[PDB]
Amino acid sequence: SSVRPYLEECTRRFQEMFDRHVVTRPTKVELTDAELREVIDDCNAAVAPLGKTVSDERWISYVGVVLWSQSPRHIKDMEAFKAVCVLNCVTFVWDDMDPALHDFGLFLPQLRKICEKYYGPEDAEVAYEAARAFVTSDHMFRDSPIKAALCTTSPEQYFRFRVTDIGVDFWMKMSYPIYRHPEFTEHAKTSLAARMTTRGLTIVNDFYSYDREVSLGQITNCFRLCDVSDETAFKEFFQARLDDMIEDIECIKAFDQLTQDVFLDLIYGNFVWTTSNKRYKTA
Amino acid sequence: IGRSSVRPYLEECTRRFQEMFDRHVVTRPTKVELTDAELREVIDDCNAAVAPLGKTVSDERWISYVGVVLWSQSPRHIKDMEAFKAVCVLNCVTFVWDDMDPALHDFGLFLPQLRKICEKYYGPEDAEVAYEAARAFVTSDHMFRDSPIKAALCTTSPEQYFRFRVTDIGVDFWMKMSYPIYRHPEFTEHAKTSLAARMTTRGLTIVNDFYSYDREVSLGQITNCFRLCDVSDETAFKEFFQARLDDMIEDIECIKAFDQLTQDVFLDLIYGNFVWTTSNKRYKTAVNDVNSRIQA
Ligand SMILES: [Mg+2]
Ligand SMILES: [Mg+2]
Ligand SMILES: [Mg+2]
Ligand SMILES: [Mg+2]
Ligand SMILES: [Mg+2]
Ligand SMILES: [Mg+2]
């Protein structure tokens, strides 16, 4: 239906949880003017062969998630940062497109081009494989009987699907070159990093994007597992999702300090971006 | 505590497991038969791969390991016995790693042997996928041997524990080296996203944890979900065991929403592992000459 009856109160509740359990706030990243126009030229060229124009605003609404959800004071590689900017901006376009627009012969080569632009050969393969995996998953699951059984069964089945489908496993495998931290790289490559962060990212996104996706008939959203019309049932479900986030965040705190910073900045950063950006005030 | 145990439940739980498979999976697993030469080629490569680490391991101990691959693949659908033989070797030699003291973990010596196994049996693309998955598994296994992260994810809740096990039990590794056996596009994708590993983690881990609890508590190993409950309390053990059965059943029922070939493979893995586990030397007694701690 719509969660707007709950939008103000739940935002307060999220923020409360972050102030209390994470504390350390994210900060938005500054691109130099050379750096920015690299990113957007690269986005426009990637989508170009698919036939879709993309407004300047829209690229900017996409890129907000990367400007806000990395871990600035750890960043060691801005080419990898622009790689993630470009990969996550075009990832969004592919996500909004009707499947019959999804041309793999044309888009996959641009993904590889991007990865070979910004990464060394080992990382470029890792980033590209994960990009290929994300766009392919998104396509073969559109209105798929598997997606239906994973998103209507239980929260546990749903978040299991979202590890890949929300894009966090992709995120980690294209972001570890930014930090060159051996622990973070291995947890990225086992996908333990993605698994640790999946629920913090997905629960936030599902809440604020519930309106768009119900309007657009999309089922990949954990709040469809409850009756948002029932206010009691929503508030029980919301609290249970809140506890999911809290247990994840406490276990993340057992990771090494650099790794925990990236994980928590990712989760909190995505919350600040998701609320304040125009991508999720409308549809 | 010291010698804590699930021996009192051994009998009823194997029956609860079996009747769960009879109701929900139905198809019985089918053990791959290896001709006598394949079994000797496998074991021949296994020795070579672990030899730089400096421990002899017996044919009896190799064959104990390889039983999981013989029993838990999907012979209805196998197309590539070279990839199958790869999985036998790789799974067998990483079992040794999992059974070793970390002081014996030499990546510089062992990783080359993994790469040679993969290049022997796979084409170019597959060799790289199988190797990254093998390396990630022996690396994760080494690096969590004492980790505070292991203790965090294994003592907080079943959800955190199974999240750790997707990698640690080795099922992501298994999927990413098994997909060339089948040349099935859907299954290949599910392997590469780890969706396949994630769907089968609980069914493999719950079965293995029950039957290896006694070995692991004695060795002081903490990666086992039944440590999250009071197995001495009969009432607490039963609620817990029941909840893990529900976990298995929910996974199996969602697995049936995958295409028919893919779910055949998923269910043969879960059910086959259960047939191997409950009919093999490794899970007959806690310490014996196929599961004993390999030492420095
Ligand atoms: Mg979307
Ligand atoms: Mg989507
Ligand atoms: Mg959404
Ligand atoms: Mg073990
Ligand atoms: Mg293990
Ligand atoms: Mg075990």
Swiss-Prot record, chain B:
Purpose of the protein: Catalyzes the cyclization of the linear isoprenoid intermediate geranylgeranyl diphosphate to tricycclic cyclooctat-9-en-7-ol in the cyclooctatin biosynthesis pathway. Cyclooctatin is a potent inhibitor of lysophospholipase.
Key word Membrane present: no
Domain of life according to the entry: Bacteria
UniProt motif (DDXXD motif) ranges: 98-101
Binding site for Mg(2+) 2: D98
Keywords: Isomerase, Lyase, Magnesium, Metal-binding
Motif (NSE/DTE motif): 208-216
Subunit annotation: Homodimer.
Sequence similarity: Belongs to the terpene synthase family.
Cofactor details (free text): Binds 3 Mg(2+) ions per subunit.
Reactions listed under catalytic activity: geranylgeranyl diphosphate + H2O = cyclooctat-9-en-7-ol + diphosphate
Binding site for Mg(2+) 1: D98
Needed co-factor(s): Mg(2+)
Residue sites binding Mg(2+) 3 per the record: N208, S212, E216
Note: 3,7,18-dolabellatriene produced by the Trp288Gly mutant has potential antibiotic activity against multidrug-resistant S.aureus (MRSA).
The protein, known as: Cyclooctat-9-en-7-ol synthase
Record-listed E.C. numbers: 4.2.3.146
Pfam families in the cross-refs: Terpene_syn_C_2
Leading EC class: lyase
UniProt free text on domains: The Asp-Asp-Xaa-Xaa-Asp/Glu(DDXXD/E) motifs is important for the catalytic activity, presumably through binding to Mg(2+).
